[PDB]
Design a protein around this motif. Structure first.
Motif, short mmCIF file in Angstrom:
data_model
loop_
_atom_site.label_atom_id
_atom_site.label_comp_id
_atom_site.label_asym_id
_atom_site.label_seq_id
_atom_site.Cartn_x
_atom_site.Cartn_y
_atom_site.Cartn_z
N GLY A 61 9.04 -4.67 -4.00
CA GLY A 61 9.93 -3.73 -4.68
C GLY A 61 9.34 -2.33 -4.66
O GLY A 61 8.12 -2.18 -4.74
N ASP A 62 10.20 -1.31 -4.56
CA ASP A 62 9.70 0.07 -4.50
C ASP A 62 10.16 0.95 -5.66
O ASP A 62 10.92 0.54 -6.54
CB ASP A 62 9.91 0.73 -3.12
CG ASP A 62 11.37 0.96 -2.77
OD1 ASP A 62 12.19 1.30 -3.65
OD2 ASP A 62 11.70 0.80 -1.57
N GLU A 63 9.66 2.18 -5.66
CA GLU A 63 9.87 3.06 -6.79
C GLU A 63 11.27 3.65 -6.86
O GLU A 63 11.60 4.32 -7.81
CB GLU A 63 8.78 4.15 -6.84
CG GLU A 63 7.41 3.57 -7.20
CD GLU A 63 6.30 4.61 -7.30
OE1 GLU A 63 6.55 5.82 -7.08
OE2 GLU A 63 5.16 4.21 -7.59
N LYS A 64 12.10 3.38 -5.84
CA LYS A 64 13.52 3.74 -5.90
C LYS A 64 14.38 2.57 -6.37
O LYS A 64 15.53 2.76 -6.76
CB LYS A 64 13.99 4.27 -4.56
CG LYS A 64 13.64 5.73 -4.34
CD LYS A 64 14.85 6.64 -4.47
CE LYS A 64 14.50 7.96 -5.15
NZ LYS A 64 13.23 8.55 -4.66
N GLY A 65 13.83 1.36 -6.33
CA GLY A 65 14.56 0.19 -6.78
C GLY A 65 15.00 -0.72 -5.65
O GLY A 65 15.72 -1.68 -5.88
N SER A 120 0.83 -1.21 0.00
CA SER A 120 0.00 0.00 0.00
C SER A 120 0.85 1.25 0.00
O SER A 120 2.00 1.24 0.45
CB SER A 120 -0.89 0.03 1.25
OG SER A 120 -1.55 1.29 1.41
N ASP A 121 0.27 2.33 -0.50
CA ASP A 121 0.90 3.65 -0.42
C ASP A 121 1.04 4.13 1.03
O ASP A 121 1.73 5.12 1.29
CB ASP A 121 0.07 4.67 -1.23
CG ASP A 121 0.18 4.46 -2.73
OD1 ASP A 121 0.96 3.60 -3.19
OD2 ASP A 121 -0.52 5.18 -3.48
N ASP A 122 0.38 3.44 1.97
CA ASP A 122 0.63 3.69 3.39
C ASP A 122 2.01 3.20 3.87
O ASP A 122 2.39 3.38 5.03
CB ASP A 122 -0.52 3.17 4.28
CG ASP A 122 -0.57 1.63 4.40
OD1 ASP A 122 0.40 0.92 4.10
OD2 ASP A 122 -1.63 1.15 4.82
N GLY A 123 2.76 2.58 2.96
CA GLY A 123 4.12 2.14 3.24
C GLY A 123 4.25 0.77 3.90
O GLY A 123 5.36 0.36 4.23
N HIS A 135 10.31 4.06 0.47
CA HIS A 135 9.79 4.71 -0.74
C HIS A 135 8.52 4.03 -1.20
O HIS A 135 8.21 2.92 -0.77
CB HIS A 135 10.84 4.67 -1.85
CG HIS A 135 12.21 5.09 -1.39
ND1 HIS A 135 12.54 6.38 -1.17
CD2 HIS A 135 13.33 4.33 -1.06
CE1 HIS A 135 13.82 6.44 -0.74
NE2 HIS A 135 14.30 5.19 -0.67
N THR A 136 7.75 4.69 -2.07
CA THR A 136 6.44 4.15 -2.48
C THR A 136 6.60 2.74 -3.07
O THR A 136 7.39 2.55 -3.99
CB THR A 136 5.75 5.06 -3.52
OG1 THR A 136 5.55 6.35 -2.94
CG2 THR A 136 4.39 4.50 -3.89
N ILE A 137 5.85 1.78 -2.53
CA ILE A 137 5.96 0.39 -2.97
C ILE A 137 5.33 0.24 -4.34
O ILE A 137 4.25 0.78 -4.59
CB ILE A 137 5.32 -0.59 -1.96
CG1 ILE A 137 5.96 -0.41 -0.57
CG2 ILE A 137 5.48 -2.03 -2.48
CD1 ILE A 137 5.15 -0.97 0.60
N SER A 138 6.01 -0.48 -5.22
CA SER A 138 5.50 -0.74 -6.57
C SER A 138 4.64 -2.00 -6.63
O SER A 138 3.55 -1.97 -7.18
CB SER A 138 6.64 -0.89 -7.56
OG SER A 138 7.51 0.22 -7.47
N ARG A 170 16.49 2.78 -9.85
CA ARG A 170 15.62 2.61 -11.01
C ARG A 170 14.21 2.28 -10.54
O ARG A 170 14.05 1.60 -9.54
CB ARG A 170 16.18 1.50 -11.89
CG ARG A 170 16.01 1.75 -13.37
CD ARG A 170 16.62 0.61 -14.18
NE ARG A 170 18.09 0.61 -14.14
CZ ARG A 170 18.86 1.38 -14.90
NH1 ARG A 170 18.33 2.23 -15.77
NH2 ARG A 170 20.18 1.30 -14.80
N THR A 171 13.20 2.79 -11.23
CA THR A 171 11.82 2.65 -10.75
C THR A 171 11.24 1.29 -11.12
O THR A 171 10.94 1.02 -12.29
CB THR A 171 10.91 3.80 -11.25
OG1 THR A 171 11.44 5.05 -10.78
CG2 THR A 171 9.49 3.64 -10.71
#
Length: 674
Positions: free
Chosen positions: A126-130, A84-87, A108-111, A150-151
């Motif tokens: 995995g997250d949006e920072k890699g 979730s975007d709640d981390g 960071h925001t989870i993908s 990498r995203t």
RNA sequence: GCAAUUUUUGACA
């Protein structure tokens, strides 16, 4: 009969936010929840109808659910994981719908995330920072892997090798990493030049099972599907999608037919690719069963009776179930993209239920359809705003009035292909209520006029046969007739007695005013509520005693519901207005605002009320008796309507984007929570 | 289907 739910729409633009396990159970992220659908014999649906039902919800995330994955390990098909975007990454048990455990390792925001197909307690996110985290939920261990700045878009653990994970990025990079070697990159699969949307491993190991180690397939926004050799780290096949159009390109690689590959395509069309060669379109003989917007997730599900199905989610808000044997659409589950603000059944088309939704489309549900338990048509033309009010014409089939949050009043011919007529007169604020009633002057000087009440406080009379003409503010007639000099109350509700002889107006100050035809003479003021009146409903005329038709229930922003009996005052026909300050019945039990009350057509004096307290309460109103409390919504109820066929069945809509059909007899609680 | 939409609504009254 049996309960049914129109759920909120599956979430968009997530590489994996839906999944299914055998038997079976389908789960889909929608808003901040996961909704669970039983599919197959276990669904317990009516014989001859599609075997599925929405059965539960995973509640606890506080922001958008971005990822969902079941455990595919025999003995633990009830475990699953979300991101979730709640981390947080949560592990759930679907049996009790509870959180087993969770972590907040991502910074960071989870993908996305994926349950290991090989290690029973491993979930990889995995997250949006890699950054990738491995998480073993039983030992509560974790490992941090920061591969590349990498995203991440998608991540898929190998079904064959417990250490290998494939990762796909926003820029088209695809790698295979080894999680036993600190996330060391084993292969760089170079070829794509735009977002990777899906990675599917060949379900057979080895590289001797394809016309041209392990094979894997990647789908991309660049409109290609690439097949790769995991021994030689190079491409072995490129598939180009057939015809800036929207695209989500996702994949399913069937276990029983490994030389075939299923993909989504432009417009949400689904394709079966023959890898030994090119493609077959799903539902080719009736193309209209296809989705009409991009498909995001594909999830295989083998039922306990061994049917091999494929579930699809889409921007078009339908969930579809495909028979993989035939490529035909087995069934469609519609979903809601906003609050269910309003519900109304047509008196002349039995079981036809109109639903006013915050996503700017009216649904009409043919609830009694024998072929399909969710036979729903969507009307969008001329709507395009939150539908806050509805009212079917009392006698004209297919004729539906609607009102919107931006003050618009319209008239649909739902039997037609035509856009609706719009009234040239708008309310300044939300349309609260629509009602049909006899015309009053100057219009009366069409059998029925359309009345609308706006949040600004004005009730308008519209001529349904001259909607481009002027609508009349009934206050001008009210003032004339009654010689009122003072400042008019702000009207917040209108309700016509069933006989068409008496109009009730609820007001912002809590007052209810009773007016008589033909000129709206004021005969009574009820002073009972102390806050804005939301809802008034007159009892039907087909009960056991004539007295029942004079009963009026009403709900305000306070929790207490009243019933008043207007027989004396109406029959006396006073020449100066009376004031009523005492209720005929009082119904206490809710703990928040009452949005809607409705009398059962099947009973004498049985009422259902919808409340901000998150419940619908059924009352034997005449005995001030709470009968049962429906608690299935997770949010504030906004509307309720009795089934026109079943004394035991009620429909309710709420700001949880759900409509529930439920049975009074199946409810454990008799009163609202205290 | 033949529209749009990376959507998914602070609370009072």
């Amino acid at each position: 009969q049996e309960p049914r739910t129109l759920p909120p729409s599956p979430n968009w633009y997530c590489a994996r936010c839906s999944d299914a396990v055998p038997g079976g159970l389908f789960g889909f992220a929608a808003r901040t929840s996961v909704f669970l659908v039983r599919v197959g014999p276990g669904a317990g649906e009516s014989p001859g109808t599609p075997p599925f039902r929405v059965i539960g919800e995973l509640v606890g995330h506080t922001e958008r659910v971005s990822g969902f994955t079941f455990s595919h390990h025999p003995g633990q098909y009830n475990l699953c994981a979300t991101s979730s975007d709640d981390g947080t990454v949560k592990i759930w048990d679907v049996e009790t719908k509870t959180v087993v455990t969770e972590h907040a390792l991502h910074q960071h925001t989870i993908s996305t995330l994926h349950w290991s197909p090989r290690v029973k307690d491993l979930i990889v996110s995995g997250d949006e920072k890699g950054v990738v985290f491995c998480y073993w939920f039983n030992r509560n261990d974790s490992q941090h892997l920061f591969i590349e700045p990498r995203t991440i878009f998608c991540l898929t653990c190998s079904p064959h090798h417990e250490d290998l994970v494939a990762i796909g990025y926003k820029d088209g990079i695809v790698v295979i990493i080894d999680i036993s070697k600190k996330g060391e990159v084993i292969h760089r699969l170079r070829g794509h030049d735009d977002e990777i949307h899906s990675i599917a491993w060949c379900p057979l190991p080895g590289e001797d099972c394809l016309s041209i180690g392990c094979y894997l397939a990647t789908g991309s926004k660049d409109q290609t599907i690439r097949i790769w050799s995991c021994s030689r780290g190079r491409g072995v096949m490129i598939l180009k999608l057939p015809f800036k159009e929207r695209l989500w390109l996702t994949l399913h690689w069937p276990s029983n037919q490994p030389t075939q590959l299923v993909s989504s395509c432009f417009g949400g069309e689904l394709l079966q690719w023959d890898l030994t060669q090119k493609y077959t379109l799903f539902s080719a003989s009736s193309e209209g069963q296809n989705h009409s917007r991009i498909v995001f997730n594909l999830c295989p599900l083998q039922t306990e009776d061994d049917k091999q199905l494929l579930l699809s989610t889409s921007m078009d808000r339908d969930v579809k179930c495909w028979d993989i044997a035939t490529l035909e659409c087995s069934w469609t589950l519609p979903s809601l993209g906003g609050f269910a603000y309003s519900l109304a059944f047509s008196s002349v088309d039995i079981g036809s239920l109109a639903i006013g939704v915050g996503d700017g489309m009216i649904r009409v549900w043919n609830t009694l359809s024998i072929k399909n338990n969710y036979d729903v048509k969507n009307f969008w033309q001329g709507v395009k705003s939150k539908v806050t009010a509805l009212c079917w014409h009392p006698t004209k089939e297919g004729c539906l009035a609607f009102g919107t949050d931006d003050g618009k009043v319209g008239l649909y011919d739902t039997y037609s292909n035509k856009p609706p007529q719009i009234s040239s007169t708008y309310h300044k604020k939300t349309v609260y209520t629509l009602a049909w009633g006899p015309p009053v002057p100057p219009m009366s000087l069409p059998s029925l006029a359309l009345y609308s009440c706006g949040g600004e406080g004005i009730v308008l009379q519209h001529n349904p046969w001259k909607l481009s003409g002027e609508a009349f503010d009934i206050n001008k007639l009210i003032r004339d007739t009654n010689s009122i000099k003072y400042k008019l109350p702000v009207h917040t509700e209108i309700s016509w007695k069933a006989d068409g002889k008496i109009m009730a107006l609820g007001n912002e100050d809590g007052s209810i005013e009773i007016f008589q035809i033909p000129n709206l003479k004021l005969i009574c003021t009820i002073q009972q509520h102390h806050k804005l009146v939301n809802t008034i409903s007159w009892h039907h005329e087909h009960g056991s005693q004539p007295e029942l038709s004079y009963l009026m229930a009403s709900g305000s922003n306070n929790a207490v519901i009243y019933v008043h009996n207007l027989k004396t005052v109406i029959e006396s026909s006073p020449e100066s207005p009376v004031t009523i300050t005492e209720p005929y019945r009082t119904l206490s039990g809710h703990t928040a605002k009452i949005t809607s009350v409705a009398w059962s057509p099947h009973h004498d004096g049985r009422l259902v009320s919808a409340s901000y307290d998150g419940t619908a309460q059924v009352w034997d109103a005449l005995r001030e008796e709470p009968l049962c409390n429906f608690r299935g919504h997770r949010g504030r109820l906004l509307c309720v309507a009795w089934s026109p066929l079943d004394p035991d069945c009620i429909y309710s809509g709420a700001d949880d984007f759900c409509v529930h059909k439920w049975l009074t007899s199946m409810q454990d609680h008799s009163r609202p929570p205290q």
